[PDB]
Assembly symmetry: C4
Homo-oligomer: 223 residues x 4
């Protein structure tokens, strides 16, 4: 436990932490410049090396963190996250993982404590509401089944499939185009379709308000 | 009261209750597979028998529950529900009742106590707001009448009928396409239509917020 | 003050009040049947006489109420209302007043005390918020002027006039079609229009939430 | 400090303040009449001189305020504002500044204390939420980058550029046309696009509710 104390004083360093945060902001700026095709045509090599650099440094960092923290590291969600977001980035382009790499910019939430407080407030609120979520999901499922067989033969895009009915009922819940776009069309064939979707909007768009209030009191009380 | 005590120990059984819940989840999965026309073409018989099985078991269950609970059974809303949702399912396809059968999946709310607490909180909130509901319904009715005769001759789809005006005013209340889709069209013929619908949106979409707050405090206080 | 005590015991009667309420509900049903052109072609005379009857009875009622209550009658808003809604109905069809007659169905709010409590709660909340209203109205006016001259030459339907800009900014505030319908079109000519409407949506749709909370706490505290 | 006390009694005058407010309301009315092309063709000269008058008086006023208040003037935000909104108006039409001149009507908020209380309540709430804002902005940025490269090749108008993806994600957050207008189109090419936008709507449209509650409690508690 001689060298172990040496890398512990490096890992626990105020410089080390600040150095990591400096790269995250740098890489975040860089990942937004990779958006410009103009910029990329002239600096893709400069950037792709910088991308391969920052990921090695982030890999060294994780390995150090593991030696210093041992099994306590995997008890930490913020570290588990940091782990999975460099592992994703470690797998080569051989093609959607190339896009998930930008999730590493969320380390700026992990690495910055002022941010963790907010996320953790929000995430801890959720298990209390897990029961209302299962009510609405059961409610969606019961109605998604009904709508599939109530309107999916004549309206396949919106209701031809359980998942399609799930998606459309979600859209109705957000109220987006629910009447002009969906229910008025359905009423040219099924004049009583409003007996299905008006009760659905009452229940769901009012249960949601409770789910809203509940979540947004627990977080208020915690902080 | 000798055999009565025997079926009471069966009905009140932890196994019995758990056995019923196991079927509900099974049937719920099954009722979602009946959505796939692919799956149905190959397993419709397997499923339709399973449907006829689960409904007999649910019928036996209700009859037992009635012998055990006698008139206390019909004093129980959760049991009245369970009753009406197997009766609906008992009537054959001879054709919308075939769809209402899936309402039996809501027994998963009845059979699971962790769920009843949430529903019952919500339902008990409602009688307090019944007075605001009757205000808005009177408000809709007074304005539905006005709009029918104010714009139903030139705009029959939206306002040609009391019920059509009711439906459109409900759509305006949710604010969906209210201007681009309804009021701007009306203003090509009736340039002052906004004197009707802007006050309607103020009142209704602000009374609704009160109805929202009221309901979503009573439920918060009850729990 | 001999006959005065006689009509006071009639006006203050539980029968009298209940008799008036009976007509309001009757007339309300009748005013909804006048919506059906089918019904009207066969019963217009029956109804139009019934309309002329109920309005005479309502006129007698108001005159009695005035003799009994004298100047206290005009100190009462609920009576002032009842007054103006039979006066409107008194003016003949010689043509929008024919439609405002249905406002008499709001006497069902006046005549029923269980309803007055709710309305009066809401109306008393308003003077406290009158200051935030004047902020938003000043805000609309300042931006309605800007948008008229910022986009009314190339977009006359939405912004060619102060009032047209007022109407469109109100639509943007409700968020209805604000991007697909208005700002994306504007950005084909004015690529920076989003510098105008995104700050406008922030401020207004967030001030509104305060105006919402304020109103919907005062009413909650009053009741 | 002899003449200094003279202009201090003028600046601090109840007449002086009231005289300034009288012009603001006058100019505000006038700036709305400059909207009418009819009115302008006949009274542009009358108005443009009145505009050049009011701005000189407002300039004299600011100079007096500076002599009286010295460095305390620039410590005052309400005065800094008044300063910058006459300076903007001082620069000639030589062309968007011609439109920003109407921002001087906001002096009616500055000059009227009943209004400052409301604005200042709102503005002081904001620094507490500055941390949640930076979360959502980081969240937008991470997703704006993803969407640009996830859909900007086949959907350039909505996602071809970081800023375009920023604008569209803002539109999705307000929920305007999010499904009919954006995600359903995307799903004709990218059938799993809903795996991107449904989680985005959950997080953002629920974090926003917290940002809403937080802001609209601080302001409620302050007042
Ligand atoms: C990890 C945290 C890092 C925080 C982010 C730091 C700031 C990010 C700067 C990177 C901006 C890249 C700008 C850019 O790529 O321009 C592209 C297009 C023109 O493309 P093109 O003409 O094809 O070349 O032109 C545009 O699209 C205009 C660019 C508008 C986007 C700039 C706004 C960035 C806000 C970042 C806020 C994050 C706060 C946490
Ligand atoms: C809960 C999770 C349920 C997941 C689920 O049911 O997946 C089905 C659908 C997507 O399946 P899919 O068949 O791919 O439909 C996609 C639409 N399409 C075909 C046009 C591309 O998934 C959806 O689109 C449903 C999205 C909303 C589910 C929200 C559940 C409400 C709970 C409230 C909190
Ligand atoms: C708890 C809430 C439960 C919600 C149940 C609401 C049911 C809504 C009924 C509905 O949307 O309409 C679907 C069915 C279809 O039958 P139908 O209207 O007869 O379709 C005739 C058109 N044709 C001849 C070409 C097939 O039409 C009906 O069966 C409507 C009868 C009611
Ligand atoms: C009583 C409580 C029971 C709880 C429900 C248990 C889970 C339900 C599983 C049943 C899912 C059936 C999937 C299915 O039918 O696929 C159909 C289509 C393809 O159809 P096709 O190609 O025509 O054959 O492909 C699809 O549409 C994809 C399927 C997406 C829907 C699956 C999401 C189910 C979420 C259930 C959550 C309920 C929580 C209480
Ligand atoms: C309260 C219950 C009032 C029920 C009612 O008035 O029924 C009339 C309409 C539906 O009648 P209907 O004549 O079938 O109109 C359907 C539209 N159509 C013709 C195009 C198929 O029903 C409606 O569509 C009205 C739906 C919303 C009523 C909500 C009342 C607001 C209370 C706020 C809580
Ligand atoms: C409590 C809130 C009560 C709400 C009352 C608001 C009234 C809104 C009036 C409105 O929407 O316009 C409808 C009427 C129709 O008359 P009008 O505008 O003269 O229609 C002329 C078109 N023509 C010749 C082909 C018949 O136009 C008018 O009468 C507008 C006059 C005001
Ligand atoms: C002063 C308070 C009184 C309270 C109101 C009492 C109930 C009102 C009943 C009057 C309903 C009139 C029904 C009607 O006119 O049918 C018209 C159309 C068919 O028209 P058409 O085929 O042309 O003959 O067919 C339809 O549009 C279907 C009718 C749907 C509307 C009926 C819903 C009335 C809800 C009233 C709730 C008010 C609560 C305060
Ligand atoms: C406050 C009262 C302001 C009244 C006002 O400014 O009137 C102007 C406009 C209507 O004037 P108008 O020139 O008739 O425009 C109508 C649209 N058109 C031409 C296509 C038929 O009136 C409007 O359409 C504005 C409606 C919304 C004003 C709401 C003010 C926000 C306060 C938030 C509480
Ligand atoms: C407090 C919030 C104050 C809000 C101020 C936001 C200003 C938004 C500017 C805007 O929407 O664009 C309007 C102007 C019009 O000038 P411009 O973009 O040059 O129009 C050129 C098109 N043409 C040649 C056919 C005339 O374009 C510009 O001036 C944009 C420059 C910034
Ligand atoms: C600094 C605070 C001052 C407060 C504002 C004082 C009131 C403002 C009055 C100025 C109204 C100008 C009316 C006008 O220009 O008419 C234009 C068009 C017809 O144009 P055109 O036919 O082309 O001639 O016709 C119309 O667009 C109808 C006009 C509707 C807008 C009038 C509503 C003004 C509400 C102001 C509320 C501000 C409260 C703080
Ligand atoms: C935060 C400030 C971020 C500013 C920023 O990223 O600027 C990029 C875009 C506008 O850039 P631009 O490239 O001009 O896109 C305009 C759309 N176009 C091309 C069709 C005219 O700006 C936007 O349109 C984004 C507008 C919403 C940003 C809101 C950030 C969410 C925070 C929640 C509080
Ligand atoms: C934290 C939340 C992170 C959100 C990640 C969600 C990812 C959503 C994926 C998505 O929207 O689809 C985009 C990609 C594109 O690949 P792909 O669907 O294969 O496009 C094929 C069309 N083609 C041949 C003409 C190129 O399609 C996929 O890769 C979908 C696979 C999952």
């Amino acid at each position: 436990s001689h060298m172990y104390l040496r890398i512990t004083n490096i890992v626990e360093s105020s410089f080390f932490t600040k150095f990591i945060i400096y790269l995250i902001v740098l890489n975040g700026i860089t990942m937004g410049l990779e958006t410009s095709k103009t910029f990329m045509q002239s600096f893709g090599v400069y950037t792709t090396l910088f991308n391969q650099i920052v990921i090695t440094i982030f890999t060294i960092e994780i390995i150090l963190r593991i030696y210093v923290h041992r099994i306590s590291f995997f008890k930490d969600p913020w570290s588990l996250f940091d782990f999975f977001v460099v592992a994703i980035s470690l797998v080569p382009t051989s093609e959607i993982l190339r896009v998930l790499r930008v999730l590493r910019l969320f380390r700026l939430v992990t690495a910055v404590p002022q941010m963790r407080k907010i996320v953790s407030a929000l995430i801890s609120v959720i298990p209390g509401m897990l029961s209302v979520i299962a009510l609405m999901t059961l409610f969606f499922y019961i109605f998604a089944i009904m709508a599939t067989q109530l309107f999916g033969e004549r309206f396949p895009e919106w209701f031809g499939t359980l998942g399609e009915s799930f998606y459309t009922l979600f859209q109705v819940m957000t109220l987006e185009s629910w009447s002009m776009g969906i229910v008025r069309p359905l009423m040219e064939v099924y004049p009583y379709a409003w007996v299905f979707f008006i009760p659905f909007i009452f229940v769901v768009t009012f249960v949601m308000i409770n789910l809203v209030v509940a979540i947004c009191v627990d977080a208020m009380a915690i902080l």
